[PDB]
Design a protein around this ligand. Structure first.
Ligand code: HEC
Ligand code: HEC
Ligand code: HEC
Ligand code: HEC
Ligand code: HEC
Ligand code: HEC
Ligand code: HEC
Ligand code: HEC
Ligand code: HEC
Ligand code: HEC
Ligand code: HEC
Ligand SMILES: O=C(O)CN(CC(=O)O)CC(=O)O
Ligand SMILES: O=C(O)CN(CC(=O)O)CC(=O)O
Ligand SMILES: O=C(O)CN(CC(=O)O)CC(=O)O
Ligand SMILES: O=C(O)CN(CC(=O)O)CC(=O)O
Ligand SMILES: [Ca+2]
Ligand SMILES: [Fe+3]
Ligand SMILES: [Fe+3]
Ligand SMILES: [Fe+3]
Ligand SMILES: [Fe+3]
Ligand SMILES: [Mg+2]
Ligand SMILES: [Mg+2]
Ligand SMILES: [O]
Ligand SMILES: [O]
Length: 800
């Protein structure tokens, strides 16, 4: 075999478990990546950790099925550190309806607490070499001799599935010589290995977490952000689960460490605890807020972390983390079954049994169901719930018990949790439509196009259709340009874009609709512009005469319809029922003088990649809430500013770039918060945007932003034609296209004149007077295109 001092990689497998009079040993088969046995561990002077944990999977019971939970045999009661036992605080946030400031309160329950843990300190003392690269670890901890801990049943039970975990790290290695392994087994059947269906998994790193998280553990770059915890040494889910048990808490706050409770609260932006070395980790951002507003001496800028997690899906999007397609963990359906801490971790944010001790007692003549039970059964309200508007007590009283208490194979609360997502899918499928190409008679000012609609009840005849926008945008074959803001026009107030609501034919004097069974042919008139040096409505649509048409249909759905065999679509004017909107996009059709295709804009990012984090078909109307958000997109300022809706759907086909391009109209922003699509999206996700319109909180991007493959596919960054695009004209000056693309991270201001000179040396312009750059001048591609001398794929920590 090979000496560990010379091994560049380690792998480790666990086997041959023995437990005898409470004495636990296990074999660690140590190899290199190539499978060569690695010798010399037991004497190696560069070992950072050898940590071995052991746990049993214990059953739970109550009404319905409850999933089994892990109990570590190794635990201890931690005292709180008094100086780091967090005080309660309050902070201002918004205003009530009368215009007075709302105060919010954050409350903690410091006090001693149990923490599960592993055996860490023994290391090589506990090892005996049994073979080449085979080391027997014999725990120092005896199962017969565990100190009693009040409330915990530590009794050894061979009939229960057990787990042992290993964390092994040498040479300070982030990856190559880091291992997390585990083995699950049934001691009472001769310590055989557990079947997938016998043990507890629930989530799987690959099926459930990597859609957002980097696992590039060896990432050496400055912006590295891999999902490795506790100094870098813990990376495997199975390892977390042995410490992060239902009964473990942080003594300094009272916060739960239970895996589900902690993970739900982190991604909801409510979790706060004090960790190693007394560092406070506040995932809400509110601690720093209160410090700045009121004073909060326990928050120490630069040491404690107080940042609001910005999750790119709703916290209600369970399928982001829990598999429903039977390609995840075999016990993925665990998320359908009630578990106090899990249910509480969203619905009871900020509540605890001290500050809300009333809930410890059920109402006169009701059964006591515990703190969380009583909340769900008795005390919850829409005003106080961790999910505003949710009415659990209404479900308890009116929805029957099976709404939350599920037998195996039933849906429980998933019936409610998945209802809008499921109906949304069905409705998109049922109302799917196609836009055929438009014929634009430009002298006549008239656009004709046919929609292939799902039925012979047309959009304007279907009261379940809220609106049906079709937007057309001029495209000159090179790149979209929004252009100056004109005076208002009948159809819109943009040079390059018109949005028309087809659901309102009868009241629109410019629109006529002619049904032919399921096909509806529309004719839009009044598309006329005097073409001059002046900005006028439809100026580009008229001078270019061709471009693309995109559909955004809004269907009203019934939030009270929970049964997927029923029709979830509902009359938009209905008053009984809470209604939500389902968005249905379309193909991107062309319009042109004869309705022939307009060659597609180049695709330079991947739709499926933005969906990894944002979910499929993410809507960004709410991103348009700052400025003139209530103006409709067929009406003056709303043409560009609307959030009701924003009229774009797809992310990677240029629909956003129709506006977000090199030529923002007016009230322009400077480069460091620029409007142009690549520049805006780079800056948001790299945290180089000087100001975000709708929040003071930087995005918490869960990948490395310098991992270009997070959004770009291999081949999309040749940069071959990029220099032929028009410059981005920001408030102060213009930036050539490759310069804008790169400087959106590398130079959002002229702070390093060397980097700015590099641009200018090689045909680029940076914050130059308008008109300076000539398309074709940038020579960037020759060195920075993928695969070149300094190719973007070579200089950046990419993971294709
Ligand atoms: C066209 C105007 C461009 C633009 C926009 C950029 N380059 Fe280059 N580049 C080259 C070399 C050898 C380096 C140094 C590499 C290293 O030190 O590891 C660079 C550097 C850059 C950067 C990074 C700057 C920073 O420190 O932030 C950026 C953003 C960049 N370049 C952009 C090589 C070349 C060329 C070789 C002939 C060509 C041509 C270009 N670069 C052109 C451009
Ligand atoms: C969600 C809105 C619920 C509804 C509807 C019902 N129950 Fe429930 N119950 C719920 C929670 C979140 C808890 C706490 C579980 C925990 O681990 O703390 C409970 C608790 C109970 C219990 C205790 C036993 C258990 O299964 O944990 C019982 C016996 C119980 N609830 C009964 C019950 C009945 C009879 C219901 C219909 C009348 C009912 N629950 C509805 C959540 C919800
Ligand atoms: C996008 C929808 C995500 C999915 C799916 C998962 N996580 Fe996540 N996580 C996400 C964000 C935006 C953040 C904050 C930014 C960051 O990466 O730090 C997090 C954070 C965490 C953390 C805290 C990391 C740290 O700051 O200490 C943990 C421990 C974590 N996420 C775990 C986790 C697990 C186990 C997931 C699969 C079940 C998972 N995340 C999915 C976004 C997203
Ligand atoms: C026991 C050896 C642990 C294993 C394995 C993992 N975690 Fe852990 N974690 C553990 C404890 C006892 C604590 C609280 C410490 C305290 O001072 O009270 C934590 C804390 C966290 C946190 C909060 C942030 C922090 O303190 O760094 C997170 C986000 C967390 N743990 C995540 C986590 C993950 C995802 C793990 C598997 C890869 C994991 N931990 C393993 C104990 C242990
Ligand atoms: C990633 C950020 C998550 C999203 C979004 C949701 N869940 Fe989750 N959940 C997540 C993890 C990592 C865990 C812990 C797994 C473990 O080892 O303990 C859970 C757990 C739950 C549970 C408990 C399951 C059990 O212990 O058997 C429940 C009941 C649960 N989750 C429900 C749930 C719902 C309904 C969600 C959408 C509204 C949801 N989770 C989102 C990670 C994440
Ligand atoms: C965050 C990850 C959640 C966890 C964990 C649990 N719930 Fe939940 N719940 C969540 C959201 C975002 C919503 C609203 C869903 C919607 O479409 O708007 C809900 C809703 C419910 C409901 C229905 C409430 C109502 O219609 O008024 C119930 C009955 C419910 N949740 C119960 C419940 C149970 C019992 C949980 C543990 C299994 C649980 N939730 C966890 C978010 C999250
Ligand atoms: C996970 C690694 C992501 C990938 C891949 C993509 N996005 Fe993203 N985005 C992510 C986070 C954590 C956030 C912060 C969310 C918040 O609520 O603040 C964002 C934000 C955006 C935004 C801004 C939304 C807003 O400020 O109104 C946009 C427009 C956006 N993301 C778009 C987008 C596109 C087009 C992507 C593929 C090219 C893409 N994102 C990928 C996380 C991640
Ligand atoms: C013109 C009809 C637009 C299209 C199509 C899209 N956006 Fe937009 N966006 C537009 C304007 C006029 C504004 C200014 C602010 C306002 O409230 O009107 C914006 C702004 C954004 C932002 C702001 C981000 C920030 O500055 O930090 C985001 C995140 C955003 N837009 C995203 C976005 C996406 C993802 C689009 C395609 C789905 C999209 N916009 C299209 C005008 C228009
Ligand atoms: C598209 C042709 C536009 C129409 C019509 C109107 N506005 Fe606009 N506005 C537009 C853009 C692209 C931007 C952002 C510029 C950038 O470089 O980021 C704006 C900005 C504003 C602002 C500043 C606040 C902001 O969100 O940046 C205001 C106050 C504003 N716009 C107002 C406004 C009014 C009153 C309009 C009708 C009279 C109007 N806009 C139309 C693009 C377009
Ligand atoms: C998602 C959060 C992204 C990350 C990570 C990176 N880029 Fe990107 N890029 C992103 C968007 C949404 C766009 C505009 C897409 C469109 O349809 O126009 C871009 C564009 C580019 C470009 C211009 C490519 C071209 O038009 O020929 C370049 C040169 C570019 N991006 C470079 C790049 C690099 C080197 C990255 C890793 C360090 C990288 N991007 C990350 C979104 C995202
Ligand atoms: C944010 C999404 C980025 C964009 C877009 C581009 N780059 Fe980048 N780059 C970024 C980071 C965070 C780093 C540091 C990575 C590290 O290893 O620590 C880099 C690095 C470079 C380098 C290496 C030389 C250096 O100056 O560090 C080069 C040569 C480089 N980047 C080039 C470059 C070009 C030409 C871009 C436009 C096509 C570009 N980058 C975009 C982040 C981001
Ligand atoms: O396909 C589904 O059933 C669910 N969708 C929505 C959609 O396709 O409209 C997201 C997804 O596939 O994860
Ligand atoms: O459903 C499809 O056929 C393809 N998808 C993504 C996917 O599910 O992988 C795009 C979408 O549904 O919008
Ligand atoms: O286009 C305009 O309306 C003129 N501008 C440019 C800009 O809005 O950034 C400033 C102005 O109103 O005089
Ligand atoms: O452009 C507008 O319509 C309003 N203005 C000033 C103005 O030019 O009158 C503020 C702004 O654009 O930020
Ligand atoms: Ca602590
Ligand atoms: Fe889908
Ligand atoms: Fe799909
Ligand atoms: Fe102006
Ligand atoms: Fe103005
Ligand atoms: Mg009409
Ligand atoms: Mg707006
Ligand atoms: O899908
Ligand atoms: O403006």
């Amino acid at each position: 075999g090979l000496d560990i001092s010379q091994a560049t990689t380690l792998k480790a497998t666990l086997e041959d478990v023995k437990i005898d009079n409470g004495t636990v040993s296990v074999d660690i088969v140590l190899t290199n990546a190539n499978g060569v046995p690695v010798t010399g561990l037991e004497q190696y002077a560069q070992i950072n950790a050898i940590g071995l944990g052991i746990a049993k999977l214990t059953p739970e019971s109550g009404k319905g099925y409850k999933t089994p939970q892990w109990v570590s045999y190794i635990n201890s009661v931690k005292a709180a550190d008094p100086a780091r036992s967090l005080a309660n605080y309050s902070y201002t946030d918004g205003k009530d309806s009368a215009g007075n400031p709302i105060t919010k309160e954050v409350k903690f329950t410091p006090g001693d607490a149990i923490q599960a843990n592993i055996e860490s300190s023994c290391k090589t003392t506990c090892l005996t070499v049994v073979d080449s690269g085979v080391y027997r670890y014999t725990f120092q901890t005896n199962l017969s001799t565990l100190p009693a801990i009040e409330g915990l049943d530590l009794t050894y039970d061979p009939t229960l599935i057990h787990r042992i975990t290993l964390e092994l790290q040498t040479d300070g290695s982030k990856d190559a010589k880091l291992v997390n392994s585990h083995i699950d087994f049934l001691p009472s059947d001769n310590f055989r290995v557990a079947k997938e269906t016998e043990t507890r998994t629930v989530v799987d790193l690959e099926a459930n977490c990597i859609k957002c998280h980097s696992t590039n553990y060896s990432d050496t770059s400055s912006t590295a952000k891999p999902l490795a915890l506790h100094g870098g040494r813990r990376i495997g889910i199975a390892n977390c689960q042995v410490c992060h048990t239902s009964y473990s808490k942080d003594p300094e706050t009272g916060s739960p460490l239970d895996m589900g409770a902690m993970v739900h609260a982190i991604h909801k932006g409510t979790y706060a605890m004090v960790g190693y070395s007394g560092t406070a980790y506040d995932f809400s951002g509110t601690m720093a807020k209160a410090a700045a507003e009121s004073g909060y001496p326990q928050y120490r800028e630069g040491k404690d972390v107080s940042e609001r997690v910005t999750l790119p899906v709703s916290i209600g999007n369970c399928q982001s983390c829990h598999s429903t397609d039977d390609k995840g963990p075999v016990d993925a359906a665990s998320f359908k079954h009630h578990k106090g801490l899990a249910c509480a971790s969203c619905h009871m944010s900020g509540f605890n049994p001290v500050d809300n001790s009333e809930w410890l007692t059920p109402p006169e003549g009701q059964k006591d169901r515990g703190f969380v039970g009583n909340y769900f059964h008795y005390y919850a309200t829409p005003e106080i719930d961790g999910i505003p508007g949710v009415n659990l007590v209404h479900v308890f009283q009116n929805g029957g018990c099976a709404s939350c208490h599920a037998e195996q194979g039933e849906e429980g609360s998933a019936k409610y949790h998945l209802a809008k997502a499921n109906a949304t899918k069905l409705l998109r499928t049922e109302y799917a439509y196609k836009l055929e190409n438009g014929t634009f008679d430009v002298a006549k000012g008239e656009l004709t196009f046919t929609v292939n609609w799902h039925s012979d009840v047309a959009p304007h005849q279907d009261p379940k259709v809220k609106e049906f926008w079709v937007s057309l945008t001029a495209f000159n074959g090179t790149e979209y340009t929004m252009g100056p803001r004109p005076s208002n026009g009948t159809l819109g107030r943009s040079e390059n874009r018109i949005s028309v609501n087809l659901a309102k034919v009868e009241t629109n004097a410019n629109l006529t609709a002619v049904p032919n069974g399921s096909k509806v042919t529309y004719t839009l008139t009044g598309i006329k512009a005097v073409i001059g040096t002046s900005s006028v409505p439809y100026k580009q649509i008229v001078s270019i005469g061709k471009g693309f048409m995109d559909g955004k249909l809004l269907i009203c759905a019934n939030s009270a319809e929970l049964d997927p065999t029923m029709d979830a679509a509902i009359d938009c004017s209905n008053t009984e029922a809470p209604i939500y909107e389902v968005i249905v996009g379309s193909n991107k059709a062309s319009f042109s003088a004869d309705a022939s295709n307009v060659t597609a804009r180049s695709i330079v990012i991947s739709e499926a990649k933005c969906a990894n984090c944002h979910g499929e078909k993410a809507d960004f109307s709410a991103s348009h809430a700052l400025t003139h958000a209530a103006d409709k997109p067929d009406n003056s300022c709303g043409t560009c500013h609307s959030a009701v809706p924003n009229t774009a759907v797809a992310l990677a086909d240029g629909s956003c770039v129709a506006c977000h391009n090199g030529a923002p109209a007016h009230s322009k922003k400077p480069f460091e918060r620029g409007f142009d699509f690549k520049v805006m999206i780079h800056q948001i996700h790299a945290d180089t945007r000087s100001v975000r319109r709708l929040t003071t909180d930087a995005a918490t991007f869960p990948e490395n932003p310098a991992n270009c493959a997070a959004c770009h596919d291999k081949g999309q960054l040749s940069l071959a034609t990029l220099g032929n695009k028009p410059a981005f004209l920001a408030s102060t000056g213009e930036y050539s296209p490759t310069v804008a693309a790169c400087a959106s991270c590398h130079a959002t201001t002229a702070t390093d004149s060397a980097v700015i000179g590099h641009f200018e040396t090689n045909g680029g312009v940076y914050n130059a007077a308008a008109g300076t750059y000539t398309p074709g001048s940038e020579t960037c591609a020759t060195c920075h295109g993928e695969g070149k001398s300094f190719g973007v794929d070579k200089v950046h920590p990419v993971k294709y």
